[PDB]
RNA sequence: CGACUCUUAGCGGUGGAUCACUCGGCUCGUGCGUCGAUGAAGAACGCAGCUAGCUGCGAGAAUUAAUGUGAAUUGCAGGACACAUUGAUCAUCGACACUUCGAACGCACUUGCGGCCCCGGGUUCCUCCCGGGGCUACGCCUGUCUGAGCGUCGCU
RNA sequence: CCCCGGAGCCCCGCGGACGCUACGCCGCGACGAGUAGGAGGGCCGCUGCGGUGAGCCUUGAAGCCUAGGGCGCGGGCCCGGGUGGAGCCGCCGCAGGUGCAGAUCUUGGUGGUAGUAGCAAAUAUUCAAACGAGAACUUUGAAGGCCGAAGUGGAGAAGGGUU
RNA sequence: CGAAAGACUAAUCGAACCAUCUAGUAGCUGGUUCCCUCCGAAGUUUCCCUCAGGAUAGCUGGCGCUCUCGCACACGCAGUUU
RNA sequence: ACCCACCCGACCCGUCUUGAAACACGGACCAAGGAGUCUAACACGUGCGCGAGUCGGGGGCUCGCACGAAAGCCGCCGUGGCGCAAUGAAGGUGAAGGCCGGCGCGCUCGCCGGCCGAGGUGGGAUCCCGAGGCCUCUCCAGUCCGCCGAGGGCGCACCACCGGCCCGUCUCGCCCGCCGCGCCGGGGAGGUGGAGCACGAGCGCACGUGUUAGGACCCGAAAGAUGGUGAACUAUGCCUGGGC
RNA sequence: CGCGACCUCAGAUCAGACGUGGCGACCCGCUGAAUUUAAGCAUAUUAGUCAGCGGAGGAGAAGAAACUAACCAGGAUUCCCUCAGUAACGGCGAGUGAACAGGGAAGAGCCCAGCGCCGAAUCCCCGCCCCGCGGCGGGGCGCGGGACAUGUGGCGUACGGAAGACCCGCUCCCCGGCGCCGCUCGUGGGGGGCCCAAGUCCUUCUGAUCGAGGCCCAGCCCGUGGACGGUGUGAGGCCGGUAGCGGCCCCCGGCGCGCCGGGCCCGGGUCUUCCCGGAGUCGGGUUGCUUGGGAAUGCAGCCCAAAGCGGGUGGUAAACUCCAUCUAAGGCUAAAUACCGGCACGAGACCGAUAGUCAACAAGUACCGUAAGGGAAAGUUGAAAAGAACUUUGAAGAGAGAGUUCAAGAGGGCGUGAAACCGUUAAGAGGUAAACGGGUGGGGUCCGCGCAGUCCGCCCGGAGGAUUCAACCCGGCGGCGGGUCCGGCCGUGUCGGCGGCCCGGCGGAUCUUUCCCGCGCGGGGGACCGUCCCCCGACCGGCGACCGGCCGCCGCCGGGCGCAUUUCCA
């Protein structure tokens, strides 16, 4: 259960919170898991997906073991566009098909300074909890 | 329903003589809502017949002995495998029905322990059946935060939380009670009498101190004892084919004289 | 119209009463709020009784109640004078004082002096500074209790 | 058989019931309990690269600064930026800013007429002229200055 | 002059239904109009809640439609097929904004009336051409007509507000 | 307001219009939602500023209780008659 | 169950009405909506708990309430309500009687010892006792078991009647009492008013029906009241223009 | 005829301050109806209610007795429960209607004028310096102004107070700063930020899964987390969250210690001598409203108009008289209490687009009205726009093919798509309008058959074929039932232990203060009674409350038995 008497557990409230979410908050919502490989290395479950990570689509039609680079992040549409994840429209023009970030797995991160410091913060909290549990 | 609901219009009846129908009709304007039908419980817009009030007598208060009588009745039938099995609880492989346990079970701080306990005691197959029942609710309570529904599980009466109520918490189905604060809403859910519980020896000792035996007061509920029984020999089959009674009955006329 | 036997009864629902119906959906929320606020006040007045001040014993008025005895509002001045507590100080040690109480009979007076005497015996006046001057009790009766007294202080039992 | 009419069924229309959804209501509760001449509420008129409405803002006008965040915004354009840099975008909001009416204040409501001090062009204080700036409501209190009275006195 | 773990049974007292949800099951008689009105029973029906069905459901829920198959005195119900595309029901309790043909009822929709009434105030149109997919109606030219300077002309006021 | 018609006062005048008191009151019209089963009326009484309504008797239903004995072994009651 | 045929039957519903197929009203058709509710108070019935009691509110103690604004507990458990006592306008008064023996004159009156203790008549479900049968494969003896049972009893509830007691009231009477002897206080007999007593039945909770007060089954006036908006139409006055 | 004091008055765009409007759920002061009820109506009622005006605050108002009472007396205000639908009012009709006591929530008490003493000992504003400065303050210094004796400040206010003499005991309280230490209850106060568990494992459905079985180890992992939401269906483990006395960073609060700057020489009792109270107010008369308040509950106007052992109250007018009880005509005060407005949250046996707010949407919008005001309708393609390229007919709208989609029998007002009503297709009928009830017939539509439906099941007789038995013993296991209650555990009624009784506790208006402790009372012992527990023996219900042996019976497994048996099959 949730016991904190200031959170909500109220369909209408959670959905309204979700759909009318502000960009910086959507960043967090649009997170996606690391590959087991990276999960081992960084000590982090998942990361906020970003403009030019390398990525697999895990479920759907485009479900496949190819590793496409991310193309853009349409936070309004809760979606990311990926390199070869696309479909030919009526008149031949390719159109980047949206995939939801959570149905995707990050194989290669785009590491900047800030992304580096984020991963350092998440790994540290994870190991504090393991120390507290032990 | 709101006070102003339905009456926020100003609407007069065009009286008789206009054909139409003597309802109050919205006054003036160049809209669809003009010369309509206000206030009447029948009209669109309108005003529900006998709008519901807040001061409906919601709460309902019950005599204290009666409340206790119910709670004794539920306890008494938490024994009786038949009444527990009939109430659905898969209590087939459980070792003894007023199921009482060691008081390390106060100790446990992890679900891990609490589940392992339930599997040794063979009470897990109730929890298993709780998982099996988890399904979506029928209809409008879905859109009002009652979306999922399931079974009631094993009760677990404890005497003191030394950690226990944390341990049994995520195990779906389980409700934990204090002995000193029992509740008929939980001991007889659905107003239905049986329910598999799991006692802690510390708690299971305390019951007689709480409720008082037949020749001893409550000694904890000031002025109380058990309710006395109306009839003692419940098995009437043992009565009716006794020597004493069948001695004194005419022989049963049983021929069938048809027309 | 009345029909065959019944109390010819007068209800008072002729004014606009539904405009002034007062529901009680508060009450649980209220009861808690008081209770929190109560526990806070205890914690603020740290070793002082949660109760309040000590209050006198007092008989009720009228032939009806007469026989019973309650807590009164505060100890009279004569009762403080005889006990030998300066009225302005008595407030500072948790002794209720009203000054509007007469004192008719000497049976009610000596009882209420006895009360204050007893209070002063079983009271633990802390010194102003941790450095200990006169009046202020020993650090023994201080360490062994900086304890609050639950319930009414020296309760009256008829 | 013929047309037409009636009945039933199939399929198609018309129409939007039903069912299923719900970023809305309705009710009960909790905490706090804050507007204004330092110009409120309300109104007006403005402001977007393409924008009418809703919203958001005020000639610094879909916002400036700051702090937090850490790559977008995205209908299309265009762009920026080096996202190893105060740094996109959101959020917060303490600095800055805040057109005109409005208690509404120079007097009027035409958006009309003014007065008084200072500044720039205009002069070379020559007042004009133009532009900018600052004052110019009523009531009232504490003081201040100037006064009034065959009001009550004193000295001359 | 004996025992039913065996008389063999139309009566069996040694143990007892195929039957016994004892709110069950069974037998005999009698009777059955009904407004207003009253009461009982509804395994009749609607929506939500506590229980409960190791219920049902993308291998197809609800709803909808059906010259298909049935049940019930009836309220109603169950199955088949179609359509649909995401939830829904049985039982035990509790709860109610719970069942429509009518209210010159309310809101929305649709007919017959009906291709009917009707498109009749103020004399008037015709020929050719152009454009154009297309001309009774546009435009140009030609003719014939009217308003007849108290104008069907030429300019404002108010009002409109971009005409 | 009226050279007077109760005329006119924004299609409204023998008392304008708007919002509220207001869901104003109504012994009077109208309507009042599923099935089966069982029982089943009254339009007469007295009183009433009562006569298109109430009250009160009556007539109806429901709940019962107390007894009775077809369990070879009955008292009481009647829209009769003697 | 779809269509068609034929014989017989068969006027359109709703409604008010003594009477509706009516030349009585409402109704073109379909969908959705649409009217005996809730609160309070009373009464009776029924179900449950406890019972001369019962009671829960209000308050408090136990939790951040996930379920909890629940659940539990309280010398508050009873301040208090209702109930356990009436009757009188009130001052007030306030439900026991009998018997026996003795002492006062047994005076159907006054005082002292013992015994019983809510009176009696009729009817009363039911219990109880029970003469006597009625047999047993024989003549008698003879405990055991029934079945019935004439006859006789205790008699619940309830009903009818008669007694009795309490309060009010009247009438008539004769005695008692003492810190205060008094315009003091107390009793008796016989009527008569009382929503009385005569070995208790209530309290709380729940459902039902009925009756009310509330918008009170739903729809409906003509009116009434408070506070505001309009003389752009029109009525009349005035100012300033125009026209014949 | 001047100059100077003061008094009363003006004027300043004089210096510096304040007030004005809004909101209005709650609150305070006025004002104040009528529908309505009374079955009519006028008093009454509706109601001191709606509308009207005024003014506030986070609450307001009230409040420290000119009180209750009549007691063995209580002791500010507010709130709840009760008092109580009571006392009372009332065309004594309809109807209306309090208070004290009692129990709670809370709890807090104070200050002037006066009377007096103190060189006005007081206040405001200037100006210079040091600190402090986003709630203009401290300290110092100025012959720098003014207020003030027509009275400022200290002491002091009815609970008495002052001044005096000696009885006693001793001396911390406040603020302006500047630091510093412990982050100080939802279990680290408040705010902000950023963080923290476990499967996309197998197979298999599916357009997509989130669905269904599965995952040896005791049960895939995690589980203080199986709330909720999102993600192409239904997800504890995909993502955000959720749990946690979990983490880190900011900021702010609140309280603890140190230093400085100031202020501050601040008691009590005892005896004496003094001191003491709010006027056009009380009170009366009155008229009008108001109240349950009745020969006047409260408020008013007008007239009269006080006193000081007085005055007020003491619920029936007055006189006499005793008692009781307060101390009016000046003021401040947190708390429990209220809250349909606001900001910010949480929840629901509520509504689910004719509902729920007028308003799920560009709604107080469009639109109407001169104006006050009135006031709608209107949600849904799909998982994704993949929103139909291209070919062709047409001036075009419209089509026909093609394509996308799981589907366009989802085509931009597009989920589902009822009925009325219409078009057509098929079938059937047709001069008494249609339609209907009952009864048959004919035709259709499908549905069940049968390409014999002769339907099964027992038992038996015969005829074929095939496995191991049953019957019996033997060994093992399990179950039932039984009495000898045999032996022991188990418990009901009784009796014995007075044995638990102090190693058995509660309760008691039983007793005792021979006791103890604390102040005749409280607490604890100590007797006593009632109730609940140990020891063994005896009798009895030997009770479903169990064990152990023995018996009898049953069943299963395995041993035995090979075939006139016991099965299977046709
Ligand atoms: Mg509505
Ligand atoms: Mg449904
Ligand atoms: Mg208290
Ligand atoms: Mg058709
Ligand atoms: Mg619609
Ligand atoms: Mg019948
Ligand atoms: Mg009927
Ligand atoms: Mg869907
Ligand atoms: Mg409802
Ligand atoms: Mg209809
Ligand atoms: Mg024509
Ligand atoms: Mg022109
Ligand atoms: Mg009129
Ligand atoms: Mg109505
Ligand atoms: Mg009438
Ligand atoms: Mg009957
Ligand atoms: Mg009539
Ligand atoms: Mg007639
Ligand atoms: Mg008819
Ligand atoms: Mg006729
Ligand atoms: Mg009519
Ligand atoms: Mg008609
Ligand atoms: Mg309907
Ligand atoms: Mg009853
Ligand atoms: Mg009645
Ligand atoms: Mg009603
Ligand atoms: Mg009306
Ligand atoms: Mg009138
Ligand atoms: Mg104001
Ligand atoms: Mg009337
Ligand atoms: Mg009437
Ligand atoms: Mg009238
Ligand atoms: Mg009144
Ligand atoms: Mg008002
Ligand atoms: Mg105040
Ligand atoms: Mg006062
Ligand atoms: Mg009081
Ligand atoms: Mg009462
Ligand atoms: Mg009144
Ligand atoms: Mg003075
Ligand atoms: Mg989930
Ligand atoms: Mg989901
Ligand atoms: Mg996670
Ligand atoms: Mg009055
Ligand atoms: Mg008197
Ligand atoms: Mg005040
Ligand atoms: Mg809609
Ligand atoms: Mg709709
Ligand atoms: Mg709506
Ligand atoms: Mg819909
Ligand atoms: Mg739609
Ligand atoms: Mg729809
Ligand atoms: Mg489809
Ligand atoms: Mg579709
Ligand atoms: Mg559609
Ligand atoms: Mg849809
Ligand atoms: Mg045909």
Q: Mutation test of the interface with chain B: which of A11, A14, A133, A134, choosing the one with the most B Cβ atoms within 10 A?
A: A11
Which of B203, B196, B201 lies closest to B122 in space, CA to CA? B196
Question: How far apart are the C-alpha atoms of C123 and C111, rounded to whole Å?
Answer: 18
Question: How far apart are the C-alpha atoms of A91 and B104, rounded to whole Å?
Answer: 73
Residues of A in contact with B150 (CB under 8 A): none
Question: How far apart are the C-alpha atoms of A121 and A43, rounded to whole Å?
Answer: 10
Q: What is the per-residue DSSP string for A48-98?
A: E--TT-EEEE-SSSS--S--EEEEEEEGGGTEEEEEEEEEE-TTS-EEEEE
* Residues of chain B that touch chain C, judged by Cβ-Cβ distance less than 8 Å: 54-55
Question: How far apart are the C-alpha atoms of C158 and C156, rounded to whole Å?
Answer: 6
Q: What is the per-residue DSSP string for B86-151?
A: HTT---SS-S-SS-EE-SSTTT--SHHHHHHHHHHTT-HHHHHHHHHH-EEPPSGGGGGT--EE--
**Resolution in angstrom units:** 4.2
Q: Mutation test of the interface with chain A: which of B137, B144, B145, choosing the one with the most A Cβ atoms within 10 A?
A: B145
Method of elucidation: cryo-EM
Q: Which residues of B174-205 are buried (b: 16+ CB within 10 A; e: fewer)?
A: bbbbebeebebebbbbeeebbbbbbbbebbbe
The total of other beta-carbon atoms located within 10 Å of residue A108's CB is 15
Strand D proximal to A65 Cβ, under 7 A: no
Instruction: Say which nucleotide is closest to residue B12, CA to C1' distance.
Output: F22
Q: In chain C, after which residues is the C-to-N distance over 2.5 Å, breaking the chain?
A: none
* C71–chain B nearest CA distance, Å: 26
Which of C11, C27, C55, C18 lies closest to C156 in space, CA to CA? C55
């Amino acid at each position: 259960m949730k016991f904190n008497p200031f959170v909500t557990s109220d369909r209408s409230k959670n959905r309204k919170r979700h759909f009318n979410a502000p960009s910086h908050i959507r960043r967090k919502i649009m997170s996606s898991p690391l590959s087991k490989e990276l999960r081992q290395k960084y000590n982090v479950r998942s990361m906020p997906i970003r403009k030019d990570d390398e990525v697999q689509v895990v479920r759907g039609h485009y479900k496949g073991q190819q590793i496409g680079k991310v193309v853009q992040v349409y936070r309004k549409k809760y979606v990311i566009y990926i390199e070869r994840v696309q479909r030919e429209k009526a008149n031949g023009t390719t159109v980047h098909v949206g995939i939801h970030p959570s149905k995707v797995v990050i194989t290669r991160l785009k590491l900047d300074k800030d992304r580096k410091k984020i991963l350092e913060r998440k790994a540290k909290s994870r190991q504090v909890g393991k120390e507290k549990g032990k | 329903v709101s006070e102003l609901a339905g009456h926020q219009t100003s609407a007069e009846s065009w009286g008789t003589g206009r054909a139409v129908a003597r309802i109050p009709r919205v006054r003036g304007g160049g809209t669809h809502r003009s010369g309509q039908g206000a206030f009447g419980n029948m009209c669109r817009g309108g005003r529900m017949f006998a709008p519901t009030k807040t001061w409906r007598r919601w709460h309902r208060r019950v005599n204290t002995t009666q409340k206790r009588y119910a709670i004794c009745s539920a306890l008494a039938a938490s024994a009786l495998p038949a009444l527990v099995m009939s109430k659905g609880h898969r209590i087939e492989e459980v070792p003894e029905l007023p199921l009482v346990v060691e008081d390390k079970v106060e100790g446990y701080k992890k679900t891990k322990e609490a589940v392992l306990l339930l599997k040794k005691l063979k009470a897990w197959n109730d929890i298993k059946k709780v998982y099996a029942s988890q399904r979506m609710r029928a209809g409008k309570g879905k859109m009002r935060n009652r979306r999922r529904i399931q079974r009631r599980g094993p009760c677990v009466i404890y005497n003191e939380d030394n950690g226990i109520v944390k341990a049994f918490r995520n195990i779906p189905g389980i409700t934990l009670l204090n002995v000193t604060k029992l509740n008929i809403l939980k001991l007889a859910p659905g107003g239905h009498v049986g329910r598999f519980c799991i006692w802690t020896e510390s708690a299971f000792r305390k019951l007689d101190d709480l409720y008082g035996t037949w020749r001893k007061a409550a000694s904890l509920k000031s002025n109380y004892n058990l309710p006395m029984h109306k009839m003692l020999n419940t098995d009437l089959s043992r009565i009716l084919k006794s020597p004493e009674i069948q001695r004194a009955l005419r022989a049963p006329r049983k021929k069938i004289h048809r027309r | 119209a009345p029909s065959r036997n019944g109390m010819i009864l007068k209800p008072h629902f002729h004014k606009d009463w539904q405009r002034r119906v007062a529901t009680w959906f508060n009450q649980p929320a209220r009861k808690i709020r008081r209770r929190k606020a109560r526990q806070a006040r205890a914690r603020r007045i740290a070793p002082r009784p949660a109760s309040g001040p000590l209050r006198p014993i007092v008989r009720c008025p009228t032939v009806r109640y007469h026989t019973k005895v309650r807590a009164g509002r505060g100890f009279s001045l004569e009762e403080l004078r005889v006990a030998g507590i300066h009225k302005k100080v008595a407030r500072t040690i948790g002794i209720s004082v009203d000054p509007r109480r007469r004192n008719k009979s000497t049976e009610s007076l000596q009882a209420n002096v006895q009360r204050l005497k007893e209070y002063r015996s079983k009271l633990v006046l802390f010194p102003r500074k941790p450095s200990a001057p006169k009046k202020g009790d020993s650090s023994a009766e201080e360490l062994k209790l900086a304890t609050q007294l639950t319930g009414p202080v020296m309760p009256i039992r008829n």
